[PDB]
């Protein structure tokens, strides 16, 4: 009858930049999705390998909640097998993911008149992330032919870039908070069950 703390995942006082995404581990608790189904704030609620009309009836070995901010047009990339700057360089789901992806518009909290420019994403990287890999390094990226020696220049870029979150952007350029719940089902007693 330990209720799982979805309140502190979905309504956390701070959300991470997608390049430095946060993971919270959920276990030893009862997960009621009623607050989640009854959101009418969520614009995305997609599950993979499981039905969302079954969740309160299911138990899992472990559950992880990954969370971060991206722009609206990029929510499509938070799904298995996707490509693009977020799926390739920031947050990668395994080809065989089991879990759910929940997202909602956070313009009111994460935008500022004149712009909030402190949510960042990785814009360059030499190779794709591995699934669930997290890369917070900040080494200068060689985009041209001449090596950079750690100096920024016209072809030598800091690898992160800022989103420009201002409330007048169209929704595809507005901030969305994302929570990814991965359900891992192992050959063991369940620690996360519905009611």
């Amino acid at each position, epitope marked *: 009858t330990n209720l799982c703390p979805f309140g502190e995942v979905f309504n956390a006082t701070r959300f991470a930049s997608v390049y430095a995404w946060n993971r919270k581990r959920i276990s030893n608790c009862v997960a009621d999705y009623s607050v989640l189904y009854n959101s009418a704030s969520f614009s995305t609620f997609k599950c993979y390998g499981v039905s969302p009309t079954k969740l309160n009836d299911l138990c899992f070995t472990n559950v992880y909640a990954d969370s971060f901010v991206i722009r609206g047009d990029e929510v499509r990339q938070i799904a298995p097998g996707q490509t693009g*700057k977020i799926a390739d360089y920031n947050y990668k789901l395994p080809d065989d993911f089991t879990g759910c992806v929940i997202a909602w518009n956070s313009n009111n909290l994460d935008s500022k008149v*004149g*712009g909030n*420019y*402190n949510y*960042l994403y990785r*814009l*360059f990287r030499k190779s794709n992330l591995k699934p669930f890999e997290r890369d917070i390094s900040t080494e200068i990226y060689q*985009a041209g032919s001449t090596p950079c020696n750690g*100096v*920024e*220049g*016209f*072809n030598c*870029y*800091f690898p*992160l*870039q*800022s*989103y*420009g979150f*201002q409330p*007048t*952007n169209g929704v595809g*350029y507005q901030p969305y908070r994302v929570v990814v719940l991965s359900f891992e089902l192992l050959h063991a007693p369940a620690t996360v069950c519905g009611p």
Partner: nanobody
Amino acid sequence: QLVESGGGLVQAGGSLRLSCAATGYTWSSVCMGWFRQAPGKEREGVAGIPSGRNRPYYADSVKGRFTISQDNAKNAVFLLMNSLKPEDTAIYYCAPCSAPHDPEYNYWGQGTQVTVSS
């Protein structure tokens, strides 16, 4: 949106200060840059100013003559150009430094014309 301004007709040897004011995805908190396009050539980087970690950098043809600066509070980038040369004649654009290699950056402004009389 973005407004660049300050361009004009100047004698050789003269000066110009360009101003850029950008908001949203035309601004970057990591690095902002001035670029230029001479007629019939391709865009060229002129100067970039990282918000930290690193000093501003300049095209070889303008080092010692141009100075890039910022005001983070007003979302402004500035290019002070001294000792101007006829071949500095071009349209000058302001954008995030990474814009030339960002396949998603489609927010290039109309620019401001600088013309240097010979």
